[PDB]
Each structure stands twice: as C-alpha cells, then as structure tokens.
Amino acid sequence: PFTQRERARQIDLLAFQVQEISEVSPDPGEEEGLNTELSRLSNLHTIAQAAAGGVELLSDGDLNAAGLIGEAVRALNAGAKYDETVMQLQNELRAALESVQAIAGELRDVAEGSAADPEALDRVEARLSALSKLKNKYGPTLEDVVEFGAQAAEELAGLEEDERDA
C-alpha cells in the first residue's frame, strides 16, 4: 500500500478476505462435532450396505445359501427314510436352514430400519469443506483463520483512515 494505487488495491484485497471469512463464520472447535457426526453417518451407511450384502448372499440373490441348503435337505429325503443317521443329519440341516433364514431376516431389519441419512452426511461434508477451504488460505487451524481475519480488518481500517486524510 505504498503508492496511492497500491493502497487502493490493498484495500480491496483486505475487504475481500474479511468478507470471505465472515461469510463462513468459522467457530474454532466446531470441527470436533462435525468429524464425530461425519464418522457416525458414514458408518451408518457402511452398516446398511453390509446387512444388505449379507441378505443377498443368504436369501435374496438368484444364488443364495438358504437355497442350496434347501436343495441339500431335499436330496437327503429318500436316504433319511432308510438310515437313522441320515434322518438325524437331515434334521440338523433343517435347523441350520432356519438359523440362516432368521439371520437373513434380522439383517433385513437392520438395513430397513437404518437411520442412514445421505443428505445429512452431505451437509456435514459441505461445512467441513467450507472450513477446509479457509484453512488452505488463512490456516492452518481455525484459530489461525479467525486471527487472519481480525488482523486484516485492523489493517483495512488503518488504510481507510489514511485515504480519509488524503
């Protein structure tokens, strides 16, 4: 801000930066809660996709575990008529089948009852993104960003006063 034109240009620069920061309004310490919420929502999605993946392999897919176990049970039927061991094993296989079906059903409940919220997740990511952008210019911490803005505002007022006198 040495020459008159330089000062004019400096005034614009400072005003821009103070404006950019004030608009986002970073509050130091806010990222703690954002990060916690980010991981919570991200994990919720992961949990829901896992449960659904298990349901497909166990029950719903064209090829599935319950389906093969059921075929096995049926293949044992004629044998079970003549041999007590096969009869016993067929019966234990039916119980295994019921367990697999019960598990698939409870996994289905997990996926269906999920509190995953993709819009919420996007909002959390958006705020972290706004703060990151400030930190990449005025950082490295939010404390640093806030002080940058405060020093810019003080410098700006000094230059406006200089212009006021000239």
Q: Is 46 in the site for a second copy (CB under 8 A)?
A: yes
Number of residues that bind a second copy (CB under 8 A): 40
The least CB distance from residue 32 to a second copy, in Å, is: 19
Q: Which stretch binds a second copy (CB under 8 A): 17-25, 61-69, 123-131, 142-150?
A: 61-69
CB 73 within 8 A of CB 90: yes
Q: Are 30 and 142 in contact (CB under 8 A)?
A: yes
Instruction: Find the binding residues for a second copy in span 97-126 (CB under 8 A).
Output: 99-100, 103, 106-107, 110
- Asked if 76 is part of the footprint of a second copy (rule: CB under 8 A), the reply reads yes
H or E stretch including 4? Answer: helix 4-24
Residue 150 is a binding residue for a second copy (CB under 8 A): no
Tokens of 155: 């410098």
* 85 near a second copy, judged by CB under 8 A: yes
- 25 sits in the region (left: phi over 0; alpha: psi -120 to 50; else beta) called left
Q: Where does residue 19 rank: exposed (0-12), middle (13-18), buried (19+ CB within 10 A)?
A: exposed
Binding site for a second copy (CB under 8 A): 43, 46-51, 53-54, 57-58, 63-65, 68-69, 71-72, 75-83, 85-86, 89, 92-93, 95-96, 99-100, 103, 106-107, 110
